[PDB]
Amino acid sequence: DIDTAAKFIGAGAATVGVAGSGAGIGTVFGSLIIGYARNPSLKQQLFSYAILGFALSEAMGLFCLMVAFLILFA
Amino acid sequence: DIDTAAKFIGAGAATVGVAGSGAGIGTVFGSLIIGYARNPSLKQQLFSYAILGFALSEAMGLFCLMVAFLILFAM
Amino acid sequence: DIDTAAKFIGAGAATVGVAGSGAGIGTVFGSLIIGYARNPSLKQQLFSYAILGFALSEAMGLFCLMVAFLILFAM
Amino acid sequence: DIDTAAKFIGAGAATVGVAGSGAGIGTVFGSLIIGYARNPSLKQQLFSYAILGFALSEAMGLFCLMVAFLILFAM
Amino acid sequence: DIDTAAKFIGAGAATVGVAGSGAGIGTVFGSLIIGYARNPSLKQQLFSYAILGFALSEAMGLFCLMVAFLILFAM
Amino acid sequence: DIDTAAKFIGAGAATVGVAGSGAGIGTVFGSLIIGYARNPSLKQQLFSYAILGFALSEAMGLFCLMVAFLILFAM
Amino acid sequence: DIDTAAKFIGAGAATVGVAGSGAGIGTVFGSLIIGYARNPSLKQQLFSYAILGFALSEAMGLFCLMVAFLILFA
Amino acid sequence: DIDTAAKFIGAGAATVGVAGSGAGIGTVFGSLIIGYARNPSLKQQLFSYAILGFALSEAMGLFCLMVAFLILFA
Amino acid sequence: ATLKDITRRLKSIKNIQKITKSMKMVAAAKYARAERELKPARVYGVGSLALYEKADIKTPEDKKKHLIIGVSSDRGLCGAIHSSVAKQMKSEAANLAAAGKEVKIIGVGDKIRSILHRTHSDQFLVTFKEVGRRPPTFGDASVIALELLNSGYEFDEGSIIFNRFRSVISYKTEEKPIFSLDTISSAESMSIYDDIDADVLRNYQEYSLANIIYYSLKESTTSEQSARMTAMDNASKNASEMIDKLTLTFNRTRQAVITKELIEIISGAAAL
Amino acid sequence: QMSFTFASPTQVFFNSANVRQVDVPTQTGAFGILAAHVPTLQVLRPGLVVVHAEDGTTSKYFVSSGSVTVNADSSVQLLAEEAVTLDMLDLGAAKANLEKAQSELLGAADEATRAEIQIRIEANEALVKALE
Amino acid sequence: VAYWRQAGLSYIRYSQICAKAVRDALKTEFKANAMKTSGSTIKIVKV
């Protein structure tokens, strides 16, 4: 089943896109740390924005994960 | 056959193009936090800029999604 | 034929080079927010530079999207 | 028996996604260092956010390695 | 021919090196915005340095495309 | 025997995961430089945080190297 | 030939290591712009440092490219 | 032999790991410029830290390069 | 002189002596207050000048639109103090024109405006009064700085002239310079100061201006009160001396009048 | 080490003192100062200065505004127009004033009036945060 | 740049308002003496 081997390699290649999400979450929470050390009064809204950014940048990696899964199972 | 096999491999390699979009959204929504922390009296305009940048990065990740789906279904 | 397989895999790989631009655009529009929050008055020149940088990064991401299309369709 | 030579390719490609976490941890801890140097008395909350960000990026790193281990040892 | 199938793979994987050039140009024109917002008096010299950096990043971008084509067309 | 080939390819493609650790160390030791330029009287603690972060980044760099070695022959 | 068709794969895979040099020159020149916008009265030392950093990033990129060429033509 | 083809493929695709060293050296030498512009009195310790950082990034760059050459000669 | 004439003179001069003594004691109390109120304000003001002495902030000879501030009260009995700064102003206020440089003038206190009017009425851009009737307060210096900034004369190099309170016995007319943002943002002595915009310096200057004006207000008030003490005491001594002299004259005239009355009485008695 | 000079027009808290750290709120962003901090010329904002003296001691003062000047030789000058130790402040009245300012912001006829009311709101918000 | 520099104020007005807030938020017994030593007795004569 060359198609099985191709599916395996396809999932392996398509799951590399989680690197973008990892780097994105790193940047978001580094920015949160700095922007909080610069203005602790705005802690609530800074955390709200950091959570929003995490949600989106993690979605952009969960998309790659779902693509890898459906390749492995379609 | 290797036709559909290579189709799967190529689609799975092209889909990686959203790594860039993920990193870009991370940077945009981090700079938003910093800029808001410096001057929270122009929050609305900052959020407008953040949405603009997020859209302009998600679009050129949608480009690699376009190529992935093209190779996946069409050729 | 492997040739069609080669076309598919090559286009898939070449559409991995759009990630760099996808992140460069986010960097540009994060710096835009930071600059605008740090000095909102010269906002119009901030757009001038932001649009220039967006154009110059998207251009050299499409420099590789075109190679992907070229490999996929022509040789 | 090609699969015995395709699981390896898939896993050695899936492991490539830990580079993103390697960059994210560096960014978060550099930002922790800067934020600390600026405002040394918030050490505790700064470190709390730093470890939160470290956890939330090594999450992605370990997801990549989990896919890698799924490919080889568990199909 | 296998080479008539491996040259496409080589090019579609070598062109992936313009991602770094895209990210570098993004960083250059983000730093230009920030530095200008800080010190608007030096607009001209700031732009000079920005365009210099832009040139020296798309230099590597074009080397990567050069290799991609050389593998694709010349040898 | 393509299981004396997929092993090598997977090892080479898993060692690429050290790029992220390189970038992470770069960012950590840039943040240390900036922070120490701000408060020179915190050097001994800024360096503590920098070493913690560098250890945490080479951790995943070595995760990638050990996956590569496990695949290569210790598989 | 399989070997002449794998030399191409090796070179076109070992050349994508120049993305690092691209990004690391972008960062050094962005930092030069920032650190000159802050302290313009220097310039002479900042450009010296920026050229040095560019030289090192260029060295890394050209090392990747020479590995590509020593895979192709050897 | 196909094992040699795989040698070229693997030991070329392992040289991409110098991209991380490129980016990291760029970051270190940009942070050095910014720090020196901010506090030019510390020119000697900012540099004693910059060289340490560059050596560390070359650590990973060389690890990747050495693994590549090891695969070429495994 | 006639007995009644010197009688009236004695009564009036005695009244002057008493009123001057009362006001001298009042001024002594107000000085006792000003010295305490100045112990901390001296620290505050001298701190607000630390930057411009740890940084070689030079004068950019090119810039010409100068500005002079002279501080003094509106009350007059103090005397010498005003005559000092006025003179000090004139001198400098002249030399600046001797280089083609323009010069505006702010007058804090009525007396400065009064003294300089005849020859500088064209240069006063704003003037302030009701100083000295109360102990100066930082709100006063903030108001003076607001009026110096709002009134769109963007001075390029200023000077404040006051009577620094040296000690109870004497003062000294000093003049502290004032720099505008241009002279600060373009000084190669300030490439070290970090994380400063060109707007941070704007706020910093718009604050240090009030700092220096308030410093001058406090110094001038203390020195003025001390000089008022001394002058009122001197006037009291003069009144005492002249009272002695005129009382001796009055005794002589009283004896003369008594003798005249006696001789007239005896002459009339003989002629009766 | 550091040499601190914290002053107000009325009184002087520290005068050429010697502390270990000073956390100050400034317009660009709150920061802490140690021995060899990089020189700066910030201008404060209504906030909470916190001084750690050479010992483990730590005292707090609410500063309405002013200017902090970190000099090259580790000489810190912190001038505030109205610096008050944190006890002398009435939290209930600060809350009431914050509510009044919040209500009045809506009737912002002239831009200058809006800015004045917003500055009052910001100062009272700083008071409320410090006192709670 | 702050919202009160777009509106066209100066740091003196800003700091006046901030100090007035910090002052009229004082405990009543302090406020009596705080109001003293915090007035503005000057009047401006317009040339």
Residue numbers in the entry:
A (entry chain P), G (entry chain L), H (entry chain K): 1 to 74
B (entry chain O), C (entry chain N), D (entry chain Q), E (entry chain M), F (entry chain R): 1 to 75
I (entry chain G): 1 to 272
J (entry chain H): 15 to 146
K (entry chain I): 1 to 47
Sentences from the paper on this structure:
The membrane-bound rotor consists of a ring of eight identical c-subunits in close association with a single static a (or ATP-6) subunit, attached to the asymmetrical central stalk (subunits γ, δ, and ε) which extends from the membrane domain and penetrates into the extrinsic globular catalytic domain along its central axis. Focused local refinement of the rotor (c8-ring plus subunits γ, δ, and ε), the stator (subunits OSCP, b, d, and F6 and associated supernumerary subunits e, f, and g) and the membrane domain (subunits a, A6L, b, d, e, f, g, j, k, and the c8-ring) improved the quality of the maps and the resolutions in these regions to 3.5 to 3.7, 4.2 to 6.0, and 3.6 Å. As it rotates, the asymmetrical central stalk brings about structural changes in the three catalytic sites, found mainly in each of the three β-subunits, which alternate with three noncatalytic α-subunits in the spherical extrinsic domain. The inhibition of ATP hydrolysis in the isolated catalytic F1-domain arrests the rotary cycle at the catalytic dwell, and in structures of the inhibited bovine F1-IF1 complex, the rotary cycle has been arrested at 27° to 32° after the pause in the rotary cycle preceding the release of phosphate. In the current structure, the postphosphate release angles are 28.8°, 26.2°, and 25.5° in states 1 to 3, respectively. Therefore, the rotational angle in the F1-domain is not influenced significantly by interactions with the additional components of the intact enzyme that are absent from the isolated F1-domain. The central cavity of the c8-ring contains a poorly defined, noisy density observed also in the porcine and yeast c-rings (S13 A–E). Here, the upper half of this density has been attributed to a mobile lipid (including possibly coenzyme Q10), and the lower half has been ascribed to another mobile lipid and the C-terminal region of the e-subunit, which extends toward the central cavity on the inter-membrane space (IMS) side of the membrane and could just penetrate into the cavity.
Adenosine triphosphate (ATP), the fuel of life, is produced in inner membranes of the mitochondria of eukaryotic cells by an embedded molecular machine with a rotary action, called ATP synthase. Mitochondrial ATP synthases occupy the inner membranes of the organelle and form dimers via specific interactions in their membrane domains. Each monomeric unit in the dimeric bovine enzyme described here is an assembly of 28 polypeptide chains of 17 different kinds, organized into a spherical catalytic globular domain that extends from the inner mitochondrial membrane (IMM) into the mitochondrial matrix, attached to an intrinsic membrane domain by a central stalk and a peripheral stalk (PS). This membrane-bound enzyme is a machine that transmits by a rotary action the potential energy of the transmembrane proton motive force, generated by respiration, into the catalytic sites in the extrinsic domain.
